[PDB]
Amino acid sequence: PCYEAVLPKEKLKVEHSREYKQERTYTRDLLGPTVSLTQAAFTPIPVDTSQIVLPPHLERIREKLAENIHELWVMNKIELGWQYGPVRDDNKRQHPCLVEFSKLPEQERNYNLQMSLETLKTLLALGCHVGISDEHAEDKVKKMKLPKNYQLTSGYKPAPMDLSFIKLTPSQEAMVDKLAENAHNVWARDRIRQGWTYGIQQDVKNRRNPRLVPYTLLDDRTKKSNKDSLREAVRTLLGYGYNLEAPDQDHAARAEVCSGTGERFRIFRAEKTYAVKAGRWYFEFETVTAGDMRVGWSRPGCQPDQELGSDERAFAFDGFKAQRWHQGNEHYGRSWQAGDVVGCMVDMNEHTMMFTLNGEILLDDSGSELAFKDFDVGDGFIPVCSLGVAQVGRMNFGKDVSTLKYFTICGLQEGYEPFAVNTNRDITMWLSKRLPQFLQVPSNHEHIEVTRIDGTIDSSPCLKVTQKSFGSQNSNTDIMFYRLSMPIECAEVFSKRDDYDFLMQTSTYYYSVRIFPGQEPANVWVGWITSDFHQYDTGFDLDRVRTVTVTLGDEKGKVHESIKRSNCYMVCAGESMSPGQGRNNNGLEIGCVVDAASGLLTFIANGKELSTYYQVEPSTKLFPAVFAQATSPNVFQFELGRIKNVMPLSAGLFKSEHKNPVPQCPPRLHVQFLSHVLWSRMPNQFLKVDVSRISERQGWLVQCLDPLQFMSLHIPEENRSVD
Amino acid sequence: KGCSLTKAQRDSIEVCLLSICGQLRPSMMQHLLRRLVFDVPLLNEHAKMPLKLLTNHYERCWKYYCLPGGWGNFGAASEEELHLSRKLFWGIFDALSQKKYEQELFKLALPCLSAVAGALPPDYMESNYVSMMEKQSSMDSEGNFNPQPVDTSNITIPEKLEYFINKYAEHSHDKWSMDKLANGWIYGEIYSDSSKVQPLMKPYKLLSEKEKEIYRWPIKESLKTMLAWGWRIERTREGDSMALYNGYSPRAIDMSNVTLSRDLHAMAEMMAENYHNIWAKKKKMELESKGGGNHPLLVPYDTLTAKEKAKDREKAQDILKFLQINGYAVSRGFKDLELDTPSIEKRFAYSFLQQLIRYVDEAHQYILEFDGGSRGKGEHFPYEQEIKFFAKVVLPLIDQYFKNHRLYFLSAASRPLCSGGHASNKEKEMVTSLFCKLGVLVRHRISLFGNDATSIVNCLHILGQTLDARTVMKTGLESVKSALRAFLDNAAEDLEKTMENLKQGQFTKGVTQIINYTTVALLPMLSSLFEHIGQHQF
Ligand SMILES: Nc1ncnc2c1ncn2[C@@H]1O[C@H](COP(=O)(O)OP(=O)(O)OP(=O)(O)O)[C@@H](O)[C@H]1O
């Protein structure tokens, strides 16, 4: 059952799959990118210690170290009431290992000796160096007395020299605690090797464990178990004088690398039509959590991908560093704590902007209160904010004057008006889109350049991709995703000098891609993709493509048919090369053929038919696509030519040219690339859904009762749909 | 550096170079700094202008060297700049120490040395790794260029390299033939230069056996001078694939289009200076053979201009590119065995402050000898130059260094300056020992001080309100603790006897000198101590 998958102290709730819900706009909690939840899977990672070689003073200390410490742990158990007996059963207060190490099973004695060895070697592997303070310390033998009755059956007196004398410094204590962490991690390693996983209770029948859990989440009683073993081991080791010198402890900063994909921040702003061109306005921004947030005014041309203040689009204020942001970073103001309000002011007519923090007006490094001295009106200014990783913020546009709390103390007497001072309908607020989409390559785009090559009598029409900024500094090499705008429609019902008749009745289409010399082709992938493809990764491989296998079976269970579904149907040119470095003579020519009647995706490279082939479902829209990493100024080229007995891609794409054997590249066809610079419109009204636990017998209830609707505009060629 | 210049010409050159270097990028001038580190320590009359230019550089770009990130636009240090700056600082410091006191030279040198000290990070680890073929011999003072050739005839090449130069011999013969084609030579039976007919239209399998050796031997020397620096070069399966696949018109695989890695671009350019220096060695030998007509291009490669340097970059680039085209691998000559970061002595500030320890203990021994000789009328001692150097540079340099690095010595990686700035506990306690020992040195010695006691008191009290006393009495070397306690107790009875003499006599000879020392130095000193104690709750 799924109820027992919940983390121990964590409580089960049924929550919205998406971040936002239906609530008041000023109480709305804007959310930044979330931290990557890598802690969900508890994978133990004990550090390997086989490479560790024990110092000679530690081999010829640890045998009697080990014997004394197991005599001490049997003392620690006789404290709880643990008695020796012939029978192995622990419940009957009898156990044959309470006797001296010679008499007790030598196998468990040796396991104790090598776990002591593991403790010492792991101290060495943690950098915890050990240096004997004085050899007279182990020359002298001080040993507390133990009565026979309080003692074990053996005459050995485990009590070493009085342990209250020695104290362990806090850093040494910390490293030793996380050494015990490593010990329980080794235990978890053993359990996983056994086949023994996390659960809620001891089920020898089900053969799961409950207690498998990270140390920070570990249970109290076993926590104290490893605490007592830790105390005993380190106290004895210090009692023998074998002083351990702590390794240097230097600070390390990770600064929230763990996040969903590469998104560092999310930008929230109003609609462009709400831009202010004259007057004076005021709004508020409430910082629920202190973080790397920015708030201020942006121009309508602000890019959702770039950070606020880097360019000329936006003017913003940063809290932690107390930095103003416009075309660079300069010092201004102070840092905010959780709950602070930092709402902004703008005077458009004299072209100035000011800021406050909990009412008091922030000042510059100099005495000037003016955050940004002077600026041109431009096309207007619109409220904006930036939320970092694991950041929560609220914006109040002053639709209701009473909700603006510091407005009365500062902003009202000066004459500032709320941004939504006179509006009957709520403000439409736009945020940065998370999922990338395919859009036309801009001409101004300095990194990607597209050339359309007209097809002559002897040459097919070609589209060639070039990088203008290749070989220059600041240029970041990352895999770009390219596709063609128009898709190929497969047949709805699968049927179960060239020859003019065959070429007229056929439904097979062909395009080819030439990888220009100098662009090594292991970085180039060629094939088809569908409209569902929206995956952006800095490192792409054919193994990680999303796929599913729907198996429809008959009544008794036989799989009478199985279907493979995937958005990506692509091949790699590096593996396509049969001769190593045999491609540098001339650019390699991947060729792709699609049979709309049968749904067969086969690839022909250098005149030979590659083994890889795909089968797609009927009525599937396939977009030609090439993914490549740039290693040369010239990356690749699209070719729209036709091989023998195959219809060029123009016939498949355009309906008016269905029966035209001559290849064509109409202006409608263009090369699009995956990009993240797009905004999304947050719906004004959301569905009303209430969830609650009825009872343990009845479970959690979900209810939605009132309808909402939106009219969607569907782009036919792109197989897309937007509100 | 030319000598025949007039004074006005020299001044014009100084101001031009000053303005240019001041307004240039910080990264550009490290090339010139590499010659400055070698020319300044002479500290002749010529080194004055280098002193100004170093002062202006380090005052402009201190924040770059101090902050690990520096300016975001300017970048950060490369650590060879740090190494050369360390060598420059130590050379100026010690050379100025062993040379005699000239008032103008020392006043001009102080800002420079004290600015290098401020620019250099205190915690700076010494780079355990060293350089190859340091070319200070090449930039020799006489002749301006010594193109020393690195010896390479000791290493031999294996059969892998045999096949490699065989294939590159085919490849070079291929460019021979395409240059032939682009030039216009044609096939024939007779030999004529004007007719454009070469006697070599017969194929490679018959091609003459002398004609590779003019490719082999130069390229052989080239690969051996690679392998002399420490390359261990190996081969991949690409050459095996070549072997398995298995006068004439060739085709050239385009080859400049493939771009190369940063470190191997640096690799090609450094091998390029080695081979251009070998070339300039034979050219210079030809010049002494002729006895005249000095070749203008005999200038160092660091001073050559890029157009003429392309002449060996093209061969560097294409030879390395064909090196991994035929599927070998590149290796750095050496990899560091171990980094000695645990050493607190590895910090710049550590070695610097122990150098201060030795110099101040030297000053202590001197002031003892000057007190033993102060009972003589004439204090004509050889150590006046040493004490002038001390009180004019080192103590003012101590002032400069601490008023540049307040935060580092006050930060113990606690929480201020989250970027860092940790001064270790024992470093801190020995700094406090230096403070107390300087105090001991300067007590009741104002009259012997040639009006330098004012600057001494300034440095003294700024050190007084810049202390780490809490750290020192929680952790320290107890002998250092005893020394500081003894200094504070000596001052303690000084205050009592100055209460006494001033109460028996309301108005103010050794006792007169010491009471003047009291009334003009201890009151600022006591104010600084008490205010520091009361602001940091010591
Ligand atoms: N190798 C061993 N040598 C000596 N005594 C042992 C050994 N293993 C277990 N014991 C004894 O049995 C007790 C239980 O140890 P242990 O933690 O291995 O139990 P477990 O029930 O297998 O659970 P887990 O290892 O998951 O915590 C110990 O406190 C000790 O008294």
Curated annotation (Swiss-Prot), chain A:
<comment type="subunit">
    <text>Homotetramer. Can also form heterotetramers with RYR1 and RYR3. Interacts with FKBP1A and FKBP1B; these interactions may stabilize the channel in its closed state and prevent Ca(2+) leaks. Interacts with CALM and S100A1; these interactions regulate channel activity. Identified in a complex composed of RYR2, FKBP1B, PKA catalytic subunit, PRKAR2A, AKAP6, and the protein phosphatases PP2A and PP1. Interacts directly with FKBP1B, PKA, PP1 and PP2A. Interacts with SELENON. In cardiac muscles, identified in a complex, composed of FSD2, CMYA5 and RYR2.</text>
</comment>
<comment type="function">
    <text>Cytosolic calcium-activated calcium channel that mediates the release of Ca(2+) from the sarcoplasmic reticulum into the cytosol and thereby plays a key role in triggering cardiac muscle contraction. Aberrant channel activation can lead to cardiac arrhythmia. In cardiac myocytes, calcium release is triggered by increased Ca(2+) cytosolic levels due to activation of the L-type calcium channel CACNA1C. The calcium channel activity is modulated by formation of heterotetramers with RYR3. Required for cellular calcium ion homeostasis. Required for embryonic heart development.</text>
</comment>
<comment type="similarity">
    <text>Belongs to the ryanodine receptor (TC 1.A.3.1) family. RYR2 subfamily.</text>
</comment>
<feature type="repeat" description="1">
    <location>
        <begin position="33"/>
        <end position="146"/>
    </location>
</feature>
<feature type="domain" description="B30.2/SPRY 2">
    <location>
        <begin position="205"/>
        <end position="402"/>
    </location>
</feature>
<feature type="repeat" description="2">
    <location>
        <begin position="147"/>
        <end position="260"/>
    </location>
</feature>
<feature type="domain" description="B30.2/SPRY 3">
    <location>
        <begin position="497"/>
        <end position="645"/>
    </location>
</feature>
<protein>
    <recommendedName>
        <fullName>Ryanodine receptor 2</fullName>
    </recommendedName>
</protein>
